Design a protein around this ligand. Sequence first.
Ligand SMILES: NCCCCCCCCN
Length: 340
Amino acid sequence: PDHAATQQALEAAVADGVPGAVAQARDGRDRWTGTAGERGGDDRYRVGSITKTFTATVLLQLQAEGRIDLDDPVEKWLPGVVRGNGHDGRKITVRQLLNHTSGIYSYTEDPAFQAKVFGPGFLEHRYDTWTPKQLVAVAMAHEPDFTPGASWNYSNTNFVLAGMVIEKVTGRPYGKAVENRIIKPLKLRATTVPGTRSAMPEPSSPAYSKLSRNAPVHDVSTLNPSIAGAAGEMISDSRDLQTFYRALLQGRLLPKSALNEMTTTVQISPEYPNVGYGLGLMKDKLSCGVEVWGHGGGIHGSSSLAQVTRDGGHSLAGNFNADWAGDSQKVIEAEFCGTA
Ligand SMILES: NCCCCCCCCN
């Protein structure tokens, strides 16, 4: 089949300090599985921010069903929720949540939240339950980053709000929509929306973090994923992630107009003009000119990647179980461009 450069890139991650690296890929046809260090090829892992693509897909389906217009103000769906210290849901649309042009303060940057969740306080608070409204409240103490539409900044609050919109439209928790609209129809048997459940399914390797930037390493495998919810709670493997992104870019989950909206991107950096962020989905043009679509994931002890070409024909997904080491871009370049 032929994935030697990608195997090499997994080995480089492990040399950089990742205890165990895994990836799978499928170039046209014929799925390849690779591991380096201490890792299993079918390992399940916390996909972090990749969850956002699932959340966006549901909202695009709901729009296609005529149940919501993504250019609706957030206030229409979540009255009074986005109002704090300059935040104004009357002036922010659901679309602007999904492409991070809302300007809404990212709750994961709140200093008290960071002390509880991202530093050594994690050891005390890792199993605490955070409601979506509690996460939004954390953000609403603060001023927005910018006026709606004026810039771009990645904000986890945007996708917690998006989950809340899904719940308002459907009358059920957003996870049920992900399950019924995506996981079940695509037969994603290794993919779950754990809610507040902290355990990891099998097979899995441990997940490791320094909770810091010398510092000790912690086994962070178990945690209450409500810190992320619709912005990052899902668990999957490297096979299911490919199945999902291939189906998505192939148009199997969305009509043409909806996928077109999803792939309408904002330039997120002047220095990287070919990197764009659409609706819970990113594009990048690699060194060899191949354009990939997908999303990265970060959560405790878990750095995830998932990418596909635009027609969904060539896919890759994988994971590092250290959050302080390993270059995920090297794996992407190796797979799509053969870059050593
Ligand atoms: N410092 C605590 C855990 C870090 C949060 C996720 C980081 C993922 C980066 N790959």
